[PDB]
Amino acid sequence: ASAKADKKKAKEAAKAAKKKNKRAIRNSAKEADYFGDADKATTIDEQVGLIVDSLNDEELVSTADKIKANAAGAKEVLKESAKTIVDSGKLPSSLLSYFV
RNA sequence: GCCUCAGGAUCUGCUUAGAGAAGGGGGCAACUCCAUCUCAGAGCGGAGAAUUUGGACAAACUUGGUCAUUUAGAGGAACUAAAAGUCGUAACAA
């Protein structure tokens, strides 16, 4: 019916908020640059992949607000969130040894 | 009972196959991919009990027939038997 397509519209709208946080935090290693570590840029990208895939969407939008609060200084937000995720015990510090 | 003609309860796999949507991904108006619970619907199948066509092997039973060996029998004709039964004295002596 039309109702199922309207629900599909609602669900893709809801999914739109989820995707762009995780990909904007992908890009924020590039707009804030790799902090002198483009040699381990791939390591930075996989580690922040673990960061965004270990968290929830409310601290995704909180960290998004924090990284548009400082566009060239997102590394403090990344290391802070790394400290929170290793304090949570969900994720190991050896995997995120660069920011922790 | 065995071998074959069938038979198909039942069970399983593969390819899709269309749909609901879970859920994620990428261009971010589009669109595409990847998973999932479900089933229409299609073949490709494979194993497959009960039952069943025909064949041969054929126990056992019935029917006679036949062989072999025992066995009943009124009655009959025996033969033998046994210290003195009766009739005659055929034979040994020409």
Residue numbers in the entry: 334 to 433
Give me lines lifted from the publication on this model.
Specifically, the C-terminal end of Zuo1 MD (residues S335 to A350) inserts into the major groove of ES12. This helix contains as many as six lysine residues, and based on our model, five of them (K337/341/342/344/348) are close to the phosphate backbone of ES12. Notably, there is no physical contact between the main body of Zuo1 4HB and ES12, except that K352 and R356 in the first helix of 4HB (the extension of the helical MD) are proximal to the phosphates of ES12. This specific embedding of a highly positively charged α-helix in the major groove could tightly lock the 4HB on ES12. Compared to the 4HB-free state, ES12 is seen to have a large rotation (~15°), with up to 13-Å displacement at the tip. Thus, together with previous genetic data, a conclusion is that multiple basic residues of Zuo1-CTD contribute to its binding to ES12, and the interaction between Zuo1-CTD and ES12 is required for the optimal function of RAC in vivo. Our structures show that Zuo1 4HB deforms ES12 in a specific way that would pose a tension to h44. Since the upper portion of h44 in the 4HB-bound state appears to be in the same conformation as in regular translating ribosomes, the effect of 4HB-ES12 interaction on the decoding center could be very subtle. Zuo1 could potentially affect the conformational dynamics of the DC through the terminal end of h44, to kinetically modulate the interactions of translation factors with the decoding center.
